[PDB]
Amino acid sequence: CTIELKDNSNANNPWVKYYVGALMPTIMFGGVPIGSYKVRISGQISLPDGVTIDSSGYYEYPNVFEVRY
């Protein structure tokens, strides 16, 4: 699964991917700026054909939080 982020303080910001890896019960990542963010998570599963990959509808956490500084 891949995880994106977007700074919610501004009215409109582009969603940015920050973590790419296997889905886990707990995910740890860093190296992100200070602004408050909204988080959407999507999963991608590879079809038997290498080229084709089935993604998921982005699920977004309703809560919005500041990065712990």
């Binding site: 740890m28 990542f29 860093g30 190296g31 200070i34 500084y69």
Partner: protein, 267 residues
């Protein structure tokens, strides 16, 4: 293949008695400069011998140099040599020799005299540079505390190098180059907001084809990292998984052999 530092491109002169010499330095894809030395000798002495027993003035990598009470109507020669941290063979590169003599025909430029400024005070010792109508502090030495700030102040007032005997700390922003260091605690710190503390050989990165060592905290993934070895033979560790490419041996032969009695076999 070590590229020696490039010598100063050009030399100019300003006079007042006092003589000022400043050399422009430009460099690209070469050794970085760490110190500048100027050697001045009399032309007749230069003919007698080459830069031998020639008085020299050293500066802490400062372009401009000042000579006070230069001889009047006497020929002289100068050279400016850049200094780097490479081996002694190509450590230093010297610029082209430029002759010069104090002459009544040389225009007198006393502006440099006013453009600087120093003061000795019971409170402290302070150096200033005249910038327009104001003066900017260069270095300070307080009497009450042995604090010595070195360098022109930042717009926000952050001094480049700072000291504090009160806290017994030496505070330097930037880099420190030493032949060796002795200490009791190499406590790496995430000084900047997004820094990545680590110890490594210069020009080495984790998961790279270089032949260095890397050890530190990867703030991007928030996991410790490690790598010892070249591209093929290496000991690479990530918080999730450890990989050891090279052949591994555990224990030693006869590790648990009886000391009092040996072993043997027969048929």
């Amino acid at each position: 293949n070590f590229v020696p530092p490039a010598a100063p491109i050009n030399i100019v002169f300003k006079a007042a008695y006092d003589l000022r010499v400043q050399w422009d330095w430009n460099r690209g894809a070469g050794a970085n400069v760490r110190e500048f030395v100027l050697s001045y000798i009399d032309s007749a002495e230069f003919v007698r011998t080459g830069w031998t027993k020639a008085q020299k003035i050293n500066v802490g990598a400062a372009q401009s140099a000042t000579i006070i009470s230069f001889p009047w109507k006497v020929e002289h020669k100068f050279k400016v040599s850049s200094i780097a941290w490479g081996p002694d063979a190509q450590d230093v590169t010297d610029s082209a020799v430029q002759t010069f003599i104090l002459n009544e025909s040389t225009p007198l430029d006393n502006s440099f005299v006013n453009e600087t400024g120093i003061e000795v005070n019971y409170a402290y010792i302070k150096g200033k540079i005249k910038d327009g109508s104001t003066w900017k502090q260069t270095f300070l030495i307080d009497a009450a505390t042995g604090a010595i700030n070195i360098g022109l102040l930042d717009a926000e007032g952050k001094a480049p190098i700072s000291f504090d005997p009160v806290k017994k700390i030496v505070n330097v922003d930037g880099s420190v180059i030493t032949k060796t260091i002795n200490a009791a605690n190499f406590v790496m710190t995430n000084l900047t907001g997004q820094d990545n503390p680590a110890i490594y050989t210069q020009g080495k990165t984790w998961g790279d084809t270089k032949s260095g060592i890397w050890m530190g905290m990867d703030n991007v993934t928030a996991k410790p990292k490690l790598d010892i070895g070249n591209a093929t033979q290496y000991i690479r560790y990530d918080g999730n998984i450890l990989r050891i490419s090279s052949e591994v041996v555990i224990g030693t032969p006869n590790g648990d052999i009886d000391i009092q009695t040996g072993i043997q076999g027969k048929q």
